[PDB]
């Protein structure tokens, strides 16, 4: 697909990074820590960090964490958004490497 390769050069390039590094975080002031850690165990080389430390802590944005994790060396950032204390949305962000900007963001719905 030529239209897909031009529109998204980073996903459809020649060779991906060999060992992807994945960061999983939760919804802001989330309570689904056990559900997000199991999603982190789904993907190899993934670590879980809570979005907010305390209830009255700094409110980091997804845009910020994407910049923070790209500096550290992660490949993708996953945010599991909760509803009724259950995982309801999966936001997949592609941080990439070197100079190309953080690529496409694919949001999903976790139903059952």
């Amino acid at each position: 697909p030529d239209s897909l390769t031009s529109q998204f050069p980073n996903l459809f390039a020649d060779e991906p990074p060999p060992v992807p590094k994945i960061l999983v975080t939760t919804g802001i002031n989330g309570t689904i820590h056990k559900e997000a850690e199991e999603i982190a165990s789904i993907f190899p080389n993934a670590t879980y960090i809570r979005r907010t430390a305390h209830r009255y802590a700094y409110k980091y944005s997804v845009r910020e964490i994407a910049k923070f994790a790209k500096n550290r060396g992660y490949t993708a950032l996953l945010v599991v958004q909760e509803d009724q204390k259950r995982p309801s949305r999966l936001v997949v962000v592609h941080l990439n490497g070197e100079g190309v900007p953080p690529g496409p963001t694919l949001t999903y719905t976790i139903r059952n």
Binding site: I28, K59, S61, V62, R63, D83, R111, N112
Partner: protein, 194 residues
């Protein structure tokens, strides 16, 4: 006849009256300093009255009603712009609500206080929401949720999931996708494949 007007509003009926079970009554009139249905803060019963309101351009105005023009509700209130400087704006109330009831002087300053802090509170949470970029959106409607719950049930049956996994895994072993001497399988099983 301000006392007679209060007797009709309080005891019989007012279109701006909101009654709650929590013990306090509320006034829905937009020209009320405090949204309460007491005598001292009724725009209707009080022929002379003052209030503070905010225009959507951000300007705070002082509305003064006098009795001498009460027969024409079109020319009823007079709009007087308040300063952005807070201590200067408090002085305009003291100058212009001179010789007024102390309640109306007091509640106009407090309404001025609340409107100024809301603007500061507005600009703070607008800056924070522009930082996070998160927005509240409606959830899925009941009929659409019923549709995706029904069509997921049919997709799950039509997938035949553990059969498809078995079918695809046996396809790769046949096609040599696992390579020679695989760590996937049992060597007495590959000799069956030839």
């Amino acid at each position: 006849s301000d006392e007679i007007v209060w007797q009709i509003i309080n005891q019989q009926f007012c279109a701006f009256k909101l009654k709650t079970t929590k013990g306090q009554n509320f006034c829905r009139n937009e020209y009320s300093v405090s949204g309460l249905c007491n005598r001292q803060s009724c725009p209707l019963a009080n022929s002379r009255y003052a209030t503070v309101r905010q225009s959507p351009k951000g300007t705070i105005y002082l509305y003064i009603k006098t009795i001498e023009r009460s027969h024409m509700p079109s020319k009823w209130w007079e709009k007087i712009k308040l300063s952005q400087n807070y201590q200067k704006a408090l002085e305009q109330i003291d100058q212009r609500l001179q010789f007024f009831p102390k309640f109306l002087i007091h509640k106009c300053k407090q309404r001025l206080t609340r409107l100024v802090q809301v603007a500061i509170r507005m600009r703070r949470i607008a800056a924070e929401e522009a930082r996070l970029g998160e927005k509240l959106v409606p959830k899925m409607a009941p009929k659409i949720k019923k549709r995706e719950e029904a069509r997921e049930r049919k997709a799950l049956a039509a997938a035949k999931l553990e059969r498809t996994i078995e079918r695809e895994l046996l396809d790769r072993l046949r096609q040599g996708a696992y390579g020679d001497q695989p760590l996937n399988c049992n060597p007495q099983i590959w000799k069956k494949v030839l």
